[PDB]
Every structure is written in structure tokens, then in C-alpha cells.
């Protein structure tokens, strides 16, 4: 894909609610898609003001074609572009909270321009998502699968709470290019390391994704 570079930039925007607090997310940030790499900076700011009262972890999942895809396997999310890509998933945690979450992605230049909407639900007041308990997600391996045109990605996560110890919450996610792909790839895995680094209502991400099998 000629507009894919090697160095590329992102530009985010978040539409959000959880447990009935409004947010909006906004932020930048500069990866490496032939590495699987990306990190940036995301602002939070509630519609009521203040620190957010949520850990941050509950979005920090909220851009394929930062994966590193080895040449045996097509890569359908640099394909995808520059006609667009479009995602959408639902979380399960273990205590009863959920959540759903879309977001598309544009692409003008060399910057990707993500814009997403979350809503999350049912969390227990004492859990570790509105309790800001949790600090990270584990690394993951990633199941993705083929059908029609599009892909399903399914993962088991874990949260690592503050004192130690996880929390589990299982992904299901549909992957959409905006034009049919040329080349649809085979059932395979994508192992993720999502880390974050948070100050306030400020939090810097960074992922390494590799495709396989």
C-alpha cells in the first residue's frame, strides 16, 4: 500500500460514557505500522470537570494497521487504506460491567484521523474500573478469523489490579474495510503489548503488535 509509510501519524477523538459519566477523549500520537508499533498522548476531559472517574484502562483498547504482518500473511488493515477501516466491539467483564465501542479511521496524508464512540455500562461502584484499581492490560494473543468480507478478532483479556492480581473481560471485535479487500488473509493470531503511563487526566500509550501462524 503506497500511502502506508513507515512512520505515520494518528489524531484521536472519543465520544464517551461510562456509568452515566460524559467524556470526551482528544489526543496524537506516531507509530510504525511495519513495526506494529504506536504510541501517543490522550486528554480526558468530563462534561462535569474534574479527574476522571474511571480507570483508564476501561479505553486504552480503542488501530490495526500498527501490526507487523509477516509476508506469508495478507495484511486486510493496511489494504484497507486509503479507502478507510471501521471497527466495532463489546467487552464483558467478569463482575457484570460491559461495554461498546466503534471507531472509524480515516486516512489524509500520512495522518490517521480515528474517531470513536464508547459507552460502557453496569459497573459495580466498588469494582476496579470505577474504583480506578487497575493498571495495565496483560499481553495478549488475539484470535482472528475470516468471513465475508470482513474479520472477527476474539481475545481473552486480564486487567492487573493495583495490589495485584486480574480481571477478566473477553472481546469480540468486527473488523470492516471500507472497500472490498483484494487479498483476504487466513485464520491467524495478532499478539498484542498495550502499556499506558498516566498522569491525571492525561495518559500516554504505546502498542507492539505482531501477526502469526
Same mark, same amino acid.
Given at each position: 500500500?503506497? &500511502?502506508? %509509510?513507515?512512520?505515520?501519524?494518528? =489524531? ?5 460514557? &461510562? #456509568? ?6 482528544? *489526543?496524537? $500520537? ?11 498522548? !490522550?486528554?480526558?476531559?468530563?462534561? /462535569? @470537570? ?7 484502562? +476501561?479505553?486504552?483498547?480503542?488501530? =490495526? ?18 479507502? $478507510? !477501516?471501521?471497527?466495532?466491539?463489546? !467487552?464483558?467483564?467478569?463482575?457484570? $460491567?460491559?461495554?461498546? &465501542?466503534?471507531?472509524?479511521?480515516? !486516512?489524509?496524508? #500520512? ?9 460502557? &455500562? ?28 470482513? +474479520? /472477527? ?5 486480564? +486487567? /492487573?489490579?493495583? *495490589?495485584? @492480581? #486480574? ?12 472497500? /472490498? ?11 498484542? =503489548?498495550?502499556? =499506558? %503511563?498516566?498522569? $491525571? #487526566? ?12
Amino acid at each position: 500500500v503506497s &500511502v502506508i %509509510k513507515p512512520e505515520m501519524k494518528m =489524531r484521536y477523538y472519543m465520544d464517551g460514557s &461510562v #456509568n452515566g459519566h460524559e467524556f470526551t477523549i482528544e *489526543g496524537e $500520537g506516531t507509530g510504525r505500522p511495519y513495526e506494529g508499533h504506536q504510541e501517543m498522548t !490522550l486528554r480526558v476531559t468530563m462534561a /462535569k @470537570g474534574g479527574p476522571m472517574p474511571f480507570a483508564f484502562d +476501561l479505553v486504552s483498547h480503542v488501530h =490495526r494497521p500498527f501490526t507487523k504482518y509477516p509476508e506469508e500473511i495478507p495484511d486486510y488493515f493496511k489494504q484497507a487504506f486509503p479507502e $478507510g !477501516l471501521s471497527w466495532e466491539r463489546s !467487552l464483558e467483564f467478569e463482575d457484570g $460491567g460491559s461495554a461498546s &465501542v466503534s471507531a472509524h479511521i480515516s !486516512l489524509r496524508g #500520512n495522518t490517521f484521523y480515528h474517531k470513536s464512540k464508547f459507552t460502557g &455500562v453496569n459497573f459495580p461502584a466498588d469494582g476496579p474500573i470505577m474504583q480506578n484499581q487497575s493498571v495495565d492490560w496483560e499481553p495478549s494473543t488475539e484470535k482472528i478469523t475470516a468471513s465475508d468480507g470482513v +474479520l /472477527k478478532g476474539d481475545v481473552t483479556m486480564y +486487567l /492487573k489490579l493495583e *495490589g495485584g @492480581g #486480574n480481571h477478566k473481560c473477553q472481546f469480540k471485535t468486527t473488523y470492516k474495510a471500507a472497500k /472490498k479487500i483484494l487479498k483476504m488473509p487466513g485464520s491467524h493470531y495478532i499478539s498484542h =503489548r498495550l502499556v =499506558r %503511563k498516566t498522569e $491525571g #487526566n492525561i495518559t500516554e500509550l504505546v502498542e507492539d503488535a505482531v501477526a502469526h501462524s
